[PDB]
Amino acid sequence: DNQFYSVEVGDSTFTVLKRYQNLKPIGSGAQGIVCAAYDAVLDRNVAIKKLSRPFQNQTHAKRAYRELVLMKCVNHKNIISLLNVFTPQKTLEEFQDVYLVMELMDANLCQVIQMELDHERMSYLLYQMLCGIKHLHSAGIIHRDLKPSNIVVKSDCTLKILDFGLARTASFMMTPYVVTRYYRAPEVILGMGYKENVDIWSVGCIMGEMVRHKILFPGRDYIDQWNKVIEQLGTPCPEFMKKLQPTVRNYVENRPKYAGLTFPKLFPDSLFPADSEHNKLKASQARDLLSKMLVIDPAKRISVDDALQHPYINVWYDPAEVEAPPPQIYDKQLDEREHTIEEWKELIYKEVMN
């Protein structure tokens, strides 16, 4: 008898419970391969993510532990839920790998970004993103790292956020894997403190990219990225500059100036469905929401609640999906706590075993 079996996927072995059959790779990310499988017990398809030795460094360790605790305690239909968690290893000293089993979605948002979408779909996708984000914020969780690759959709336009972002705290790793910074807010890029609407910026970047079918602010690094920002949105005004630390403030001033394009120029009508009157109007509303989300200074950038109330969005509004009961978060030492790899290993083990 063994509850598990082993099969090779790419340069990896998945050792999984026997209920999970017919594994096929569906994606890859910073902590390895994700597979689709049929779950014979629930009689339905699932997704299975393997974490290889997540305690191997502080960064993987903190993310893995945080994602476990949060996926368990968070209950919302726009945030991916955990069906099952397991390790095939029998003891702490043998412990190597964690397997996360989630409901299976059909695609990530990068694939949606490569297609044209009507306004009904686009606005519903954004409505769901905002609901999820609001639910996180209600629990004290500010993501700060929303990106298309960590957001998934089904064929029926339902949407789920995969991860819980960066902890309020604090990260070196020897790797080929390059982190995507394109969707990060100015206040993150310039480390100036932030609030809830730091996540609106990322939504605007995704919405903009949904319309333009191009990454809004591509850069090799944060210098580039900041240039790309100011050369489309224009150099921010003085009352913003005043809130930067003198070392970064100094630097932002001395950048070559741009007054910046306008939203009709940034997002012309030829990008939008605008054949009918319905679509002409929706196009106008979309551009308007964009212009309130892609605002450099967060004191003047629209909030989550006001974004949910915007005419482009509020057609979907429902007090069940917004205003849901916040998660419990039984830990509360969670976002910030530091440990050795040996300690992280046991933390993670305990959580996998409950």
- Is 79 one of the binding residues for ligand AMP (CB under 6 A)? no
The residue sitting closest to ligand AMP, measured at its beta carbon, is: 29
Query: Exactly one of 4, 12, 23, 29 binds ligand AMP (CB under 6 A); which one?
Result: 29
Helices (H), 139-197: 186-189
Task: Give the list of residues 6+ apart from residue 3 with CB closer than 8 angstroms, or none.
Answer: 17, 18, 88
Query: Exactly one of 14, 17, 20, 26 binds ligand AMP (CB under 6 A); which one?
Result: 26
- Is 295 one of the binding residues for ligand AMP (CB under 6 A)? no
How far apart are alpha carbons 182 and 87 in whole angstroms?
A: 34
Of 145, 163, 199, 335, which one is the catalytic site residue? Answer: 145
Look-up of token digits 């209950």:
75
Query: Exactly one of 49, 62, 76, 144 binds ligand AMP (CB under 6 A); which one?
Result: 49
Query: Exactly one of 17, 35, 37, 47 binds ligand AMP (CB under 6 A); which one?
Result: 47
Query: Exactly one of 104, 126, 233, 294 binds ligand AMP (CB under 6 A); which one?
Result: 104
- Is 35 one of the binding residues for ligand AMP (CB under 6 A)? no
How far apart are alpha carbons 76 and 327 in whole angstroms?
A: 9
Q: Which stretch binds ligand AMP (CB under 6 A): 22-30, 123-131, 240-248, 284-292?
A: 22-30
- Is 71 one of the binding residues for ligand AMP (CB under 6 A)? no
Query: Exactly one of 52, 56, 57, 149 binds ligand AMP (CB under 6 A); which one?
Result: 149
How far apart are alpha carbons 162 and 136 in whole angstroms?
A: 12
- Is 112 one of the binding residues for ligand AMP (CB under 6 A)? no
Q: Kindly write down the DSSP assignment for every residue of 214-241, as one continuous string.
A: S-SS--SSHHHHHHHHHHHH-PPPHHHH
> In this complex, which beta carbon is closest to ligand AMP, that of residue 80 or of residue 266?
80
How far apart are alpha carbons 284 and 264 in whole angstroms?
A: 9
Buried b (16+ CB within 10 A) or exposed e, 182-206: bbbbbbbbbebebebbbbbbbbbbb
> In this complex, which beta carbon is closest to ligand AMP, that of residue 203 or of residue 244?
203
β-strand 20-29 against 13-17: which pairing, if any? unpaired
Q: Which stretch binds ligand AMP (CB under 6 A): 51-59, 149-157, 218-226, 334-342?
A: 149-157
215 known member of a binding site: no
Q: Give the end-to-end CA distance of the chain in Å, rounded to a whole number.
A: 24
Decide: helix, strand or coil at residue 119.
helix
288 catalytic per annotation? no
Look-up of token digits 């970004």:
113
27 known member of a binding site: yes
> In this complex, which beta carbon is closest to ligand AMP, that of residue 104 or of residue 188?
104
Q: Tell me which residues touch ligand AMP (CB under 6 A).
A: 26-30, 34, 47, 49, 80, 102, 104-105, 108, 149-150, 152, 162
Annotated binding site for ATP: 26-34, 49
Write out the catalytic residue numbers: 145
